[PDB]
């Protein structure tokens, strides 16, 4: 059973969320299997950011067991701004564990592959949900290949009706257009340029997505075994894979206990709707 | 100074918000002056629903001092559903006190009776409001919604404290600084009850937002209707509780009514059923 352990108050520099298996911390990057059911291509998604929130929370590559923490820029907490007509993030936003976009192999981010989960229920930070892949988009975020897998929680009431990317157009009309717009404009309020998509913004289909996911997983297989070119930056401690160099069961025990803190308030500025 | 007095937990049937002046409840409907500054057409807006929320909180016409209470549908809490690409209400949403959309007359602009409520206000500024807030706003324009067949004007307004307020003086300025907001507003009020099994609404003037001058005229009309109502001179007061603590010349004046309200019993927000998360694609 997967739960979460929260250190500190939400919306602070000290905030951290660890994933626990049966009460013990494990690595959110390395220890959650990519597949919940490999035969039927059911994936485990680590959720970072709930739909309709702003705080830019991410699995941290550089800290032990890769807790989810808030991104910062020059010491200041990062929040995505509200870009009309959107409110914060428009998907449950996360990553697949045991994936790595190797920045030495080419057509690369050095991060796990990103996942947009489009189901009805709002997710929680640190949630491990089981999803099926529907398709994939290729954003060029600031000079780099930034895949966005489109997926759905298998528990969603619509899940059996969605198998491939065309089903998103059918049941969620306008969501793909919104996704294109969102990723184009979301950093404009931060003073950054409009982003661009490859494939003229087309969402490639499920087969294409599975190909990309499998290839980011193989790379990761060699990261954690230690045979990769350069795991610089990235911390590779894990506690579930007994025959890896960086297996360190003690890492679990070194994590502080759950702090019991109410969410810190968020600056009223974050309310603002930007018309861009 | 206006403050709020909260009874119970938000998102429960027991929740109530009274508006207070001097730490004592007054009627949210009758005792808050429509005008903060008559000469400059600055209005007091009572906020019911913060932007990007769902709970359908309303001034309660039938309850003494007219606290804000969550509306119910056959005894269950009412939440407006998320209509793609919107999240909850896309405005800070409320009303002008001391107004009444007269249900006892047909309104010539829409050829329909009035909705039986204070006139509704959409406040478009950047800061998310709170339930029971009294804020000062300038009117910019107005739209004529036919909400299930009734005249349901929507005033377009902005908080005078908004950074943009000095640059927003008439309805054209909304399109300039908030491009798309008016078109989205038209869409929102057309579709927002479709997830409840109701039909699409329609607007008069093909959804045109009339200007500030037009808006001030309609607001005046609803203030005049309220004056008749609160004097006991309406042809049908619709079971509205007219109790008030500030209007001595009215038959339902009673400074004492304020004392009979229980003390604040604020509890943490109750959870909302996960169904309310759902995004509807219409
Ligand atoms: Mg990042
Ligand atoms: Mg990512
Ligand atoms: Mg990126
Ligand atoms: Mg990425
Ligand atoms: Mg109503
Ligand atoms: Mg109303
Ligand atoms: Mg209405
Ligand atoms: Mg109304």
CATH topology of chain A: Inorganic Pyrophosphatase
Q: What is the first-to-last residue Cα distance of chain A?
A: 43 Å
Looking at the structure, what is the overall shape of chain A?
A: globular
Oligomer: homodimer
How would you describe what is shown here?
2 copies of one chain form a homodimer. Chain A is an alpha+beta fold. The first copy, chain A, has a single domain, classed as Inorganic pyrophosphatase (Inorganic Pyrophosphatase, Alpha-Beta Complex). In chain A, 15% of the residues lie in helices and 26% in strands. Chain A is built from 4 helices and 16 strands. Chain A has helices spanning 165-171, 175-185, 206-225, 250-253, and strands at residues 2-7, 16-21, 24-26, 35-37, 42-49, 57-59, 68-70, 72-73, 76-77, 82-83, 92-95, 114-117, 128-140, 145-153, 196-197, 273-274. Chain A has a 5-stranded mixed β-barrel with strand order 5-11-12-14-13. In chain A, strands 1-2-3 form a 3-stranded antiparallel sheet. In chain A, a hairpin with a 4-residue loop joins strand 4 and strand 5 (42-49). Chain A is globular, with a radius of gyration of 18 Å. The structure holds magnesium ion (8 copies). Residues 115, 117, 120, 152 of chain B line the site of one magnesium ion. Chain B: It comes from Saccharomyces cerevisiae (strain ATCC 204508 / S288c). Chain B: Homodimer. Chain B: Belongs to the PPase family. Chain B: It is an enzyme of class 3 (hydrolase).
